[PDB]
Amino acid sequence: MTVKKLYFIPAGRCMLDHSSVNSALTPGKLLNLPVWCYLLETEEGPILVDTGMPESAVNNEGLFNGTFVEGQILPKMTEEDRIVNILKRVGYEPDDLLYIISSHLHWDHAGGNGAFTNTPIIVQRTEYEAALHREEYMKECILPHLNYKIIEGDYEVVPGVQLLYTPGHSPGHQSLFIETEQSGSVLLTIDASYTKENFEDEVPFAGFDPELALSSIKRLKEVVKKEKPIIFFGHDIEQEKSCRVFPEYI
Template sequence: MTVKKLYILSAGSCYLDQSAVNRNLPPGKLVNMPVWSFLLETEDGPILIDTGMPDSFVNNPDYYKGTKREGRLVPNMLESDTIVNVLKRVGYHTDDMQTVISSHLHLDHAGGNGHFRNTPIIIQQAEFDTAMTDDNYSPLECRLPDLQYQIIEGDYDLLPGIKILSTPGHSPGHQSVLVTTEKSGPVLLTLDGAYTKQNFENDLPFLSFNSEMAAKSLRHLKKLIQEIHPTVVFFGHDNRQASKGRTFPEFL
């Protein structure tokens, strides 16, 4: 069995200092980074990858004012970008999701996890352990300890056509996802294994918990691409890629 449809869903954006996107650049300039969620329609029901930013970011670009992130991270989120409303556009409610895959628990990927209190949320052990004890994971909506976490370690075959790949480095327990769809065949979602195509192809360093681990994970993803030749490689926050379409209502 393969996945029937993969929808790439826009969930707002955030402005990030360019030095976090490319460590070779000086700080001081903000770049706009698109934020995504991914909906997989399967025979077992819909599965969601990442839940976007927290509701507390809505119309609140000054969220980080007065903190160490002021001037380096600015949310750009409307009410329509909450995961509840993102799913409504596709005709789903949060309770319809059979499973949520959290690539990691950073603010732009796990902010909506609290809307899925009765849904299994798949997360790597290292990510869970770190996030629940590290105040650098912000805001609190990303660090809810009482959800229905399904803790895994390493690569994991969720269903035929959905393979979770352990790609630590950007965060301690980051994971990417390889999806095989009826229409497109293998599709690699790097998530934050690589922010952009330039990060990926030119080995440009970006924000990471451990740069050596991040580089090793990139090599792992490149080797996988050589082996399976995915029809699409979709990066975590690539503006150029976002402008090319193939996002909802289109599907892969």
């Protein structure tokens, strides 16, 4: 009826311009932001939420040189941050997992998806379809022959694990509402808000459709008023300071 453990697992980092967390801002200063994956230990088995950055980012800050985001995005990833290595340390191999949940298919959330060729990968149909053609999607993030479990809208993965459709930051972005044994209700916004102020204060941030992102935030706020969860944001360096991370769980 509840998830036994929820682990916050650091998966490397990334430098972005600060206008990414506040659209109104003028570019110049850099921000070293956390990249996260999460692992859920459940009665039915372990579930991994997101898979970190692509192998091409390892020891390669200059990954995006040449492209349309040169200098605006610098991955900070070492060999330890490869998702397979992360799992090996938590104590699993890819084929051990019950499901992978892709919040969305941006490079910092699905770069490791290719490592999982048997596990069903739960992703929104609108995200998948967008990844097939929009330019912000890397080939590592859409590989054609993985075992996708394509869903549309809200969805219960296993008891205590609910996906909430929250498009806007990307066309098919989804957040998680989790009931854990130790903490009760937890809302993982993922990138439906990078920071606490994108959420509470509705400050605009990096995204595909800000009108949609705002209505997804208002939808999450209705949920919060009802369930009163503890809430964790997608890329928030102030909140990161106090987050209990692996090997602690919540």
